[PDB]
Write an enzyme that holds these catalytic residues in place. Structure first.
Site, mmCIF file in Angstrom:
data_model
loop_
_atom_site.group_PDB
_atom_site.id
_atom_site.type_symbol
_atom_site.label_atom_id
_atom_site.label_comp_id
_atom_site.label_asym_id
_atom_site.label_seq_id
_atom_site.Cartn_x
_atom_site.Cartn_y
_atom_site.Cartn_z
ATOM 1 N N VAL A 81 0.956 -1.343 -0.079
ATOM 2 C CA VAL A 81 0.125 0.060 0.078
ATOM 3 C C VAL A 81 0.774 1.245 -0.101
ATOM 4 C CG1 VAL A 81 -1.740 1.340 1.108
ATOM 5 C CG2 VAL A 81 -1.673 -1.311 1.443
ATOM 6 N N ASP A 182 -10.701 -10.602 8.424
ATOM 7 C CA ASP A 182 -9.605 -10.386 8.955
ATOM 8 C C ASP A 182 -9.604 -9.058 9.960
ATOM 9 O OD1 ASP A 182 -6.789 -10.834 9.372
ATOM 10 O OD2 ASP A 182 -6.458 -9.936 7.405
HETATM 11 C C1 LIG Z 1 -0.409 7.949 6.916
HETATM 12 O O1 LIG Z 1 -1.274 6.974 6.330
HETATM 13 C C2 LIG Z 1 -0.909 5.721 6.898
HETATM 14 N N1 LIG Z 1 0.006 5.343 7.459
HETATM 15 C C3 LIG Z 1 0.469 4.103 7.878
HETATM 16 C C4 LIG Z 1 -0.579 3.195 7.663
HETATM 17 C C5 LIG Z 1 -1.910 3.603 7.156
HETATM 18 C C6 LIG Z 1 -1.996 4.758 6.458
HETATM 19 N N2 LIG Z 1 -2.991 5.092 5.781
HETATM 20 C C7 LIG Z 1 -3.981 4.393 4.798
HETATM 21 N N3 LIG Z 1 -4.894 5.145 4.340
HETATM 22 C C8 LIG Z 1 -5.679 4.401 3.667
HETATM 23 C C9 LIG Z 1 -5.544 3.053 3.159
HETATM 24 C C10 LIG Z 1 -4.335 2.257 4.073
HETATM 25 C C11 LIG Z 1 -4.430 0.977 4.215
HETATM 26 C C12 LIG Z 1 -4.960 0.004 3.157
HETATM 27 C C13 LIG Z 1 -4.968 -1.442 3.260
HETATM 28 C C14 LIG Z 1 -5.706 -1.946 2.581
HETATM 29 N N4 LIG Z 1 -6.357 -2.577 1.793
HETATM 30 C C15 LIG Z 1 -4.025 -1.877 4.219
HETATM 31 C C16 LIG Z 1 -3.381 -0.967 5.177
HETATM 32 C C17 LIG Z 1 -3.313 0.118 4.897
HETATM 33 C C18 LIG Z 1 -2.242 -1.679 6.020
HETATM 34 C C19 LIG Z 1 -2.489 -1.331 7.421
HETATM 35 C C20 LIG Z 1 -0.789 -1.813 5.256
HETATM 36 O O2 LIG Z 1 -0.064 -2.278 6.538
HETATM 37 C C21 LIG Z 1 -2.748 -3.460 5.871
HETATM 38 N N5 LIG Z 1 -3.592 -3.101 4.663
HETATM 39 N N6 LIG Z 1 -3.570 3.337 4.854
#
Ligand SMILES: COc1ncccc1Nc1nccc(-c2cc(C#N)c3c(c2)[C@](C)(CO)CN3)n1
Length: 331
Positions: A81, A182
């Site tokens: 991502v 999940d």
């Molecule tokens: C500053 O932004 C961030 N910093 C750290 C983690 C997440 C974010 N922001 C963010 N914004 C939108 C979507 C996602 C996301 C979507 C998926 C999916 N499908 C996804 C994750 C994040 C994980 C936590 C990635 O490890 C798991 N699978 N994140």
């Protein structure tokens, strides 16, 4: 539907959820078929659901119409991502890049055209040859997984507040016959001030076949190989609850090996509930961690009890990013 996909195929368009969903089923079938000789110019097709992401002459290609910038946000179930920007529009969002042969149509069917503040909005999905790019609203606070790791463990009111928002999202999904599959801290995203939480990553979703997620969060019916329903999400939501309170997954501090045997055989992990918890908190988790799914409370029912548990402890008072509380030690 078969005329709809025929008309959508080979193009990126602005359209509606049902159009993305119809074309997503075609991608999942392609991933099942053997790889062919790739054309000079890769197939480019999909549906953008927001005006923030604009196709140009029915194309939406990485590096050309949009680019990733800075380092990845993390790893999702089936892809990395990244932060991305539309080069025409300047609007930022999150992109998960999934290999076609690993892509499940449920990635999109489970969240396409849903309007819950507790579910990350889907912006669309675009295929470039054997890559599916899944576009969604960017949430700046990061994951509930990162906060728990950073803070050691959350205070009770904060844990209840987030569990509460997760169960509002699961109620919305469950009433539309969608199993998340999940539910864990890592798949709850927070706003920049930490006040809003939203479910993300529908990699393990089923429309009511369940690919189990993290063994620590799996319901007994899953582990025993029995058929599953929305109740599996309620069990994992309380495993995530114990994770936020104790600063460790349930099971892991008492058992080794593949835990699936212990989850089947042991009483539910109700002994991991901290003695210092309010009576209604302990009761909420107990009813969520019933081994028989028919007797386990619904997401709607647990949401009620958790809202009451939060009031009982005096509401959300604990600060956004307070001080490190030492996670529970192994016995
Ligand atoms: C500053 O932004 C961030 N910093 C750290 C983690 C997440 C974010 N922001 C963010 N914004 C939108 C979507 C996602 C996301 C979507 C998926 C999916 N499908 C996804 C994750 C994040 C994980 C936590 C990635 O490890 C798991 N699978 N994140």
């Amino acid at each position: 539907e078969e005329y709809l996909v025929h008309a959508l195929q080979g193009s990126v368009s602005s359209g509606q959820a049902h159009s993305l969903t119809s074309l997503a089923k075609t991608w999942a079938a392609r991933g099942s078929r053997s790889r062919e000789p790739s054309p000079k110019t890769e197939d480019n097709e999909g549906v953008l659901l927001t005006e923030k992401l604009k196709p140009v002459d029915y194309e939406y290609r990485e590096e050309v119409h949009w680019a990733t910038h800075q380092l990845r946000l993390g790893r999702g179930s089936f892809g990395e991502v990244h932060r991305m920007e539309d080069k025409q529009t300047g609007f930022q969002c999150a992109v998960k890049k999934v290999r076609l042969e690993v892509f499940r149509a449920e990635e999109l069917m489970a969240c396409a055209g849903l309007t819950s503040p507790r579910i990350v909005p889907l912006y669309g999905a675009v295929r470039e040859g054997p890559w599916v790019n899944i576009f969604m609203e960017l949430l700046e606070g990061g994951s509930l997984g990162q906060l728990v790791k950073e803070q050691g463990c959350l205070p009770e009111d904060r844990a209840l507040y987030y569990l509460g928002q997760a169960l509002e999202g699961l109620e919305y999904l469950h009433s539309r016959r969608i199993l998340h599959g999940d539910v864990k801290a890592d798949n709850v995203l927070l706003s920049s001030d930490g006040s809003h939480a939203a479910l993300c990553d529908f990699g393990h979703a089923v429309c009511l076949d369940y690919i189990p997620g993290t063994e620590t969060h799996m319901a007994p019916e899953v582990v025993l190989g029995r058929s599953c329903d929305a109740k599996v999400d309620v069990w994992s939501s309380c495993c995530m609850m114990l994770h936020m309170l104790n600063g460790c997954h349930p099971w892991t501090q008492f058992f080794r090996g593949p835990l699936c045997l212990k989850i089947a055989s042991e009483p539910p992990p109700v002994r991991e509930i901290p003695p210092s918890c309010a009576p209604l908190t302990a009761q909420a988790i107990q009813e969520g961690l019933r081994k028989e799914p028919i007797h386990r409370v619904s997401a709607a029912e647990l949401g009620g009890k958790v809202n009451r548990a939060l009031q009982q402890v005096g509401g959300l008072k604990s600060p956004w990013r307070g001080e490190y509380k030492e996670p529970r030690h192994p016995p």
